[PDB]
Structure formats: structure tokens, C-alpha cells
């Protein structure tokens, strides 16, 4: 579609002028004296007269700076140009000096800055246009805020003046830059795409959506842990299109008196239908509508009923949707989770590591940075922070970088010199100081992301890998062929084996191969439910996984609650879970005989995969996996470590590499305690050649650390699990028969 | 409306209810409907303030102040009929009670036939296919399912319906029809169903799903078929019927698949509560929470409520409540209680006392002419080569 | 003061808090101090009436309605930081938290050096002796 063109630099000084190309004249049919609208970023536009020149390229417009800034476009971004035949003369655009280069002149300046500048051009000026006028070494920009014609105006010199107000400072610009775009959000990208598909496609097209018969959503809960900018995503979804925003703050409508708060909610809902198809956002919905237990007085119940009535009294013709944001979607009064009021529900949870990059890219935008700083390094580090925690992290790093310069920035420096204000950049160890020493993270809860441990982290075990492929890979990667002959899929296996053979490290591997989501609740997170008698508190971790349907929720030592229940609730939700969703439940254990036989009943956990001790071609993979970080000398052999440690568990040779690491750190601090202990310390023959005694683990560090190796599992327990494998059937019967001819 | 008369101020809501009742006698023999009655009349535990009790008393007075000459009836709709203030479940106020429960599979067809009325459909779409699929949705869930299928069909065409197409061309507005895999996408990948509770419908497993066992079949005919299909001949010589047997046998010999078969033959209704749904009552000490599943079955009187591994609550109670309602249940209703177990010796001997569970039918392992029927039953879906012998 | 704004009548205490916050922006970049915050904002269990919840919501709104251009910070002081309504421990309202705990022995010296400033002392008195003691 020949509408959008790239923008490059210009030479000319004339203003409200856009450059079109001369080889393409007959498609547009507009001559020189026609007014046009120019589409810019973040849904803000400007108007111009055209210039037809040859100095522009074929797809590139040469335009001046102030309308490049009113469209908010920079080098590479692509803008649109369109004709607008509604050009007309107007009365009293409201100019206002928004610059500090007025130099304290007041009164009528408009006889030398306005009237000779606008004429003999038919200058089109839109509301919010930021054109400047320079006169007498005074570059004052006149941003109009009140235009009686619509949308733009042509200034007449016969227009009477109205300029009694006072020129103001940069705050009116600061309440217009927070008409934010999609770029100001990270860490919730897939959910932003989902909520965009839920909201904007009704909002941008309200005609064919009602004409087809698809229902617009009437309520979207933005639930999730606090501080991740749940209101910022509502302002983003609003201001990216022609949507009106309205922010019903939570406790602000509870701060009012009795009876008047219902009038506040009625005014808030009436101002939605006053404006366009709009969007109202009610943050902290639990403060005005908690669960019915925490409703002591009657005024909260009256306000909750008023909100329910105002929600149900909506129209399909109103085209206004409502959003809210709590922490956990069981913490709302469940009367308003019914149909027609709040049906859809999206989880802007905690961001993952790759989503944690851009959320501090947007916070380190306006700061000077060093070279040693690596945002990927702090990305894979701090796995458990939220976006406001990262803002506090950046703020504390800035304070640490200021604090390390206060030895020469003294208090006697009253008028502060601007040398530090353009020559200070935060470096890497300041980030490490602000991250490790300070900022306790505000996060404990479950996490949902794909894992990253590949299949070559535990090599071998090809039978277990092939079985897990047939049980997890195929009902996701090939859903149609399962309905060819209609075999219903299974719903999860039960791993069992000795402690520390890579049970969890294998259960994450199929999630990493399928690119499926993965939660992980453990034993201690399990039995704290029934130590506190929260037996009916697994429904939320089940439908958390159902919210991210390609998932594998992984229990861990689920026989630990059989130390004598919550098995009965974990079973009734396993049966209540439908099978079309591909969520699988793989649990692991260490004593598979103490487990409840009802959970091994066919229908909920059928297969019993036995993870043995790691074999020869696997222990070379585990030693090649734990040695990813630490450098190893090339003469250090690991294949010789394979056929020397036969019956060692996987959790045991992860210790002997931590033992050889600990021994090499002992040799390094041993060297650094005698390097500075120089007697007859001559300043001559300086340390331009460093010692560097142990830049990697040597062979004798391994040969000394190997002498403290110890097998954790005995021979009596591997013999116990083999006896459990034969207590299990594994074709306990005939075998090797054939069919008659 | 329910919360709309609770959104008003104090005292004026009683005037709203008085205006609402007076406008009934203003017009013809009429019908007033009060949705979400629990919001204005919850159980007496959840009445903290006094204004709710005044409104509840006002509703009770306006209900009892009706006339037989007024010819106006009142309706209300809650979720569960124990969640109302039981003062207004008395006589003269709310006597009758009907259960518009979750629809079955054959009732699920027309409820999306009415939702796909104004849409263009393809040929690969089969409403019977989505009918026997999604057994646990409600009608608003199916409206959301149809809406999400329409959104999926729009979303698969946005590669050529671009944002630069400002004035939208009407070509898609008369040439787009949702097809089968869009319904499968909206059903399987999305729409978590808003339903867990019990279900009431006739089953569909016939008698040839477990062939043979003719002695057990003949006994179940004499114990279930005859007090329904021939109620008058039982009063000829006046033998009182029994009230249910106790199946017992090895795990997985088609106990439940047999207990559904007599329900399918009698065309009687069938609920099914299981072991884990049983012992979660007394893990939470909800021992007096079986009255509702008994009179749920009494609401659908030709029914066979089927327990399953009812010795699982004998892992050490709710047996005492399940017994006192079994004795309290009248015998003119033909509701039978057939329970199954795997360890019939650990069971409580009070439940085998003659009067509540008398017969003890022993389901053995399936014999020769039955295993051919089970392999001819599990192979209904998947195609099998003709040279494969069963 | 904490209980002083709870000693007022209903409705007028919110006007007291609004006056207190408005007098901050009346003056310079300032600092308001609310001692005994649990008396006006306890945990949600110990909120029987509705007036405490209205006052807590008023404080939350006045806290969130601040500006980066106002340059006024707020301080509070309770005994244990679980004894406050955890709605106001969120981000943007009360993020940082410092522990002025019990002083140690070497910190116990100067805290009675400032109390024995205006008294005549003998020679046998040893403040280090009462420092490592008590």
C-alpha cells in the first residue's frame, strides 16, 4: 500500500512543510497548496503543507526537526502522509510560551513573533504542534492547546488575541510524555500480545465484530504480583489507539464518605459513556471488594453491590470494557467472577530471565553506562525480582556510583560543578554491589517459564528418553494423529529411584525439548499445606498450570506427606482435570513402596519409570555439565573419571567438582596470602608480570579431591529398587507367543 | 435484580421492593423474577448487619401477604438451595423447586445451534462432534466458545487483513466461515470449563459392553428393572422392594461399567460419586453434607446413586450419615444405592445389615465370552485390520 | 502524632491528615513523621469498625498521590514491620526500611554520655563499666 515512507534529514528552514516526490504526482493528484496530515508515533499527529522537490529520495521524506519531534519520529521509522480536505480558517488558537528562553519578557510579544511569521503561506497548525519562532536571540516555541476549529487551524492576522494566562514550565510536557507506547513495557510480552488480541480488535473494529456475532469481552482481570506496572499496561493499551482512559483508583473511592462513593462510581461509569468507546481501570480491587469473610461493615457490601450493578448494567452498544488488577484471583468477592462481569483473566506474572533484559533496558535508557556493565549478566542473575525491584536496583546503583565519588564531591562544593553531571557512568561492580549486598527481593512464589537444561545434560538413558518422548512429545507435537485412531493420551508418569540421579534434571528436559511450560512445587512446599491444614489449596496451583496449558507440573518427593490428607485433594483434581489440555503430572519419589496405592491406580499415574544410577556414558556428561562454568586444564581427563567411579550417584560427583573447586580456591588464597607477604620488598622489579598461580583447576586438585569421594546410596538400596522393579510386573507372565495362520 | 436493590440506601430499598410488588397487582396476572436471591437473602450466618435482616423480613412479609386472587407468582434463582435463608423455604412462600442443571450431551447440541444461528459455517464443522466432546460446559461457556472460534477465524485471516486497510473491505464480511479445527483450537487450547459438580443423565453403555455374567444381569433385572417397569404387580401380592446391593470383587472387572448398564437399560437417571469425592467430606469434617446429594437424586427419582470404593473411608464418620439417610429415605421412590468395593471384609457390618444393603453380588474376573466383548468394546474408536483376531 | 489523629471525631481526622499533607507542600522539601503507625493502621485483623479502614485508605491515597516534584518524604515508626497493614508496605508507598534496633555495648556508652552531660560525676564512676554491664 503506497502510503508509508521513511524519513531522512532535510536542508530547508521553512516550517509545517512536508516533502513529497516529483516522479509520483498522478497517484495523489494534490498540488502545492494543499494541506495534509502526517501520521507519527504513539498516536500523535501533525499537519503540514506540501513541498514538491527533487532533493528527496524515492521512499524518503526530507522534513525539519520540530514536526519530526511532533510526530516523534527518528532515523529509520516510517511515517504516513494523507490528504485532509477539511482546511478552514479559525479564531484564537491559544499560544503559550513553553520555553525558558523567554528571558522574563512579558506582555504583548506577539507583534514580532506571530503576525509576520504565519502569513502568505496558509500555515496549518494542529493542536499540540511544537513549532518555534526565533526573534531577538529568543527561540520561543508556541504549542497551541485550544483550537476553536477542528482539528487544525489557519492563522489569520485579523484574529483577535486572548493571552491573559502566564507562561508555564516543563510540567505540561511531562504530562504528555506519559501518553506512553508499547515500547515502555517489557517483561510481559506474550501477555501483552494476548491482551492486545483480546481488546484492540474489538476496539479498532466495532462494526464487523458485532456484525459477525463475536462477543466483546466485558471484563479483564489483570491479576498478578504487585509492582509490575499493572496500571501501566492499561494506559499502554488505551493510548495506543483511539481509546479514552479513566483511572478509578482503589482506596481513593474508599477514602470518601458514606454514600458519596457510590456517586463517585456512578460518575466514573457515566464519564465512560460520555466519551468514546473507552477503558476504565480499577487497580487494587480487593481494597473495594475483598472476599466475603473480610466484609465487617455494611458500606463495603453496598459498594460491592453498586459495582456489580454498574457492571451488569452495561451494553453491547457502549463498547467500553473494564479492567482490574489484584494479586491472586481468589482474593476477590466471587460474586463478581461470574459470567457477564469478569469472564476473561490474564496472568501478567513475574518475568523470566530473557524478559528481564528489556525491563531494565527501559530503566537504563537515560543513564550513562560503562563498558564492563553487562545487562545479560544481570539478566541471568537475579532470577527472582519484579520490575519495581529492578527500578530500585537501578536507583541504588546510581546512588552507589554517586557515593563512590563523594570523596572529591565535598559538602564545601556549594555550587555544584557540572563535570560529574556529564562524566559519570555506573559500572559493573556497582550493579553487583546493589544486587548482592542490598535489595532483598520481593518474591517467593511459583514461576512459569520453559527450562533450559538440554538433553545432553544427562546423556544416555535412551529408554527413558524414548518413553518420555512417546508420553509427552507426541501429544503436543502431533495432536491430530492421536485422533486418527483415537487413542486417549495418558496423564503423567511417576519417576522413582535413588536420591540424586537427576530426577528433576530429567523432568525439566522434556519440558525444554517440547518448549512447554514448567512449574515446580517441591516436598516442603507440599507438606506446608497440610501442616497448616490448607488441603483445599492446590486448586490454584492446578489452574495456574491450566492457565499455561502446555505445561508439566512436577511434584517432588510426594511420599514426604506419607510420613504418618492432601493426597485426596491432589487426586480429585487430577481426575477433575480434563484431558484435552496437555498438562502432565510427573512426580518423583525415593521410597516407592510407602506411597499411596490409590495414586498408582490406572487413570491418574500409570507408568512407573525407574531412573537407575547413572551409567558410564552419562557420568562423562554430568562431569562435562558441572564443569561448564569453571575452567579446566586440557590435561585433566574426564573419560577416565567415568570408568573409575562406577556406582556413584549423580548427586555425589557433583560434590567432587565442588571439592576440587574448593581446593583450588584454597590454593589461590594461599598464594595471595604470601604474595603480599614480601620481605625486603623492593619497589624495583614491579609486578608488571602477574603471578596468576591457578587460572584453572589442575589435575592434582582433582587427584587430591577425589580421595574424599563417597558413595551416598548403598548397595542395599539399589538392591531394594531392583526388588521393587521385579515386584512391579514388567511382563510378569508368558512372553513370546504368536497368532494362528 | 438482586444486587440492584442492595445498591440502594437504607430504608429506600424496602420501598423499592414494595413498588416492585405493587406494580405486579397494578398489571395483569404477572411474574416477578428475583435473580441472585442469596445476595439479598443469604444464610443466617452471613447476616452481619441489621439491614439485610430487615430486607429479608420485608421480602418474607411481602411473600406471605399475597392472595389467591392476585394470580401472580414469584421466581428466584440461586446456585444451591441450601444457600438461601431457610425461613423463606417454608410453606406458602417457596414450596416448589426445579433444577435447571447442567445440560447433557444431546441437550448440548441445540444450545450451540442457537448460538451458531447468525454465523456462516463450513462443512467440516460437526456440532455433534463438539456435542459429545466438551461434556462439562455450561451455556455461557458455549457462547464464549463460539465467540473464541469467531476470533480464531478472524485471527487466521489477519495476514491479509492488515492495519493499513483502514476502510475495511466487505469481502471478508460475506466470505468467512469458521471451520472445524478453529472449534477444536478454541475448545482444547482455550476455554477452561466452569464446571466440576455432579451430573444427572442416563448413561449410554449398553449390555453388550460386558457380555455374559447372565446371573448378575438376571439378579439386577429382578432388583432394579421390575420395580420401575412393573410397579403395579409388586402391589398385587405386596412384596416390598429392596433398596440396593453391594458389588464386590477384584479391582477393574467392570464394576462401574456394570452399574451404569442397568441405568441405561431402565432409562433411569444416574449420578456417580466416587471414593475421593466421598472422603473429602470427612477430611474436611463435612459429615452432614450428603443430604444434598441424596435429595439431588430424589429430585430425579428414577435414579441409581452409585458409590465407589466406599471402604476407602475405612482406612482408619460419614458412614453414620450415609446410613441414617438410607433409613430415612422412603421406599416408594425407586432410587437405589449400589456401592462397590475391593476389600469387602474391612467394610462396616452395620451397612450390610438387612434393611439397607442386603444382597452381595460377587463380580468375578471376566470369562471367555466376556473378554471378546471387552476387546470388541475398547476397539470401537480405533480401526482394526480384518485379519486381527480377537 | 499517632493517637492524636485518632482522638478526633469521625470525618474530621481525614481533614487533619489532608491539612498535614498540604502543609508539607506549603513549605519547602520537607519531612513528615508519623509515630505509632499501628495505632492508625494496624493489621487487618484488628480493624473492627469502619472508621479505621477509612483512615487507612485516606493515608494510602495521600501517600500514592505524591509527586517526584514535591521532594517530601514520609517516615513512620512501629515496633515490628509485620504489625502494619500490609497494603501500605507495597511499592511506591513504603519501600525502604531501616532497623534502629537495640544498641550494643559500645553504642551504649555515648547514649548515657549524652544523659550524664549536665550532672556532676565522681571519679569512681566508670561509664565503660556500666557499658559492658546492662
From Swiss-Prot, chain A:
Changing residue 139 to T: In IBMPFD1; uncertain significance. Changing residue 158 to R: No effect on binding to DERL1. Changing residue 134 to S: In IBMPFD1; impaired autophagic function. Changing residue 503 to A: Impairs catalytic activity of RNF19A toward SOD1 mutant. Does not inhibit interaction with RHBDD1. The modification Phosphoserine is found at residues 16, 441, 668, 736, 741. Residues 674-693 are annotated as: Disordered. One of its GO terms (biological process) is positive regulation of protein K63-linked deubiquitination. The modification N6,N6,N6-trimethyllysine is found at residue 294. The keyword Transport applies. It catalyses: ATP + H2O = ADP + phosphate + H(+). PROSITE patterns: AAA. ATP 2 binds at residues 500-505. It is found in: Cytoplasm, Cytosol; Endoplasmic reticulum; Nucleus; Cytoplasm, Stress granule. Changing residue 162 to W: Severely reduced binding to DERL1. The modification N6-acetyllysine is found at residues 481, 484, 634, 720. SUPFAM superfamilies: ADC-like, Cdc48 domain 2-like, P-loop containing nucleoside triphosphate hydrolases. It is linked to Inclusion body myopathy with early-onset Paget disease with or without frontotemporal dementia 1: An autosomal dominant disease characterized by disabling muscle weakness clinically resembling to limb girdle muscular dystrophy, osteolytic bone lesions consistent with Paget disease, and premature frontotemporal dementia. Clinical features show incomplete penetrance. Frontotemporal dementia and/or amyotrophic lateral sclerosis 6: A neurodegenerative disorder characterized by frontotemporal dementia and/or amyotrophic lateral sclerosis in affected individuals. There is high intrafamilial variation. Frontotemporal dementia (FTD) is characterized by frontal and temporal lobe atrophy associated with neuronal loss, gliosis, and dementia. Patients exhibit progressive changes in social, behavioral, and/or language function. Homohexamer. Forms a ring-shaped particle of 12.5 nm diameter, that displays 6-fold radial symmetry. Part of a ternary complex containing STX5A, NSFL1C and VCP. NSFL1C forms a homotrimer that binds to one end of a VCP homohexamer. The complex binds to membranes enriched in phosphatidylethanolamine-containing lipids and promotes Golgi membrane fusion. Binds to a heterodimer of NPLOC4 and UFD1, binding to this heterodimer inhibits Golgi-membrane fusion. Interaction with VCIP135 leads to dissociation of the complex via ATP hydrolysis by VCP. The PIM (PUB-interaction motif) motif mediates interaction with the PUB domain of RNF31. Necessary for the fragmentation of Golgi stacks during mitosis and for their reassembly after mitosis. Involved in the formation of the transitional endoplasmic reticulum (tER). The transfer of membranes from the endoplasmic reticulum to the Golgi apparatus occurs via 50-70 nm transition vesicles which derive from part-rough, part-smooth transitional elements of the endoplasmic reticulum (tER). Vesicle budding from the tER is an ATP-dependent process. This is Transitional endoplasmic reticulum ATPase. It comes from Homo sapiens (Human).
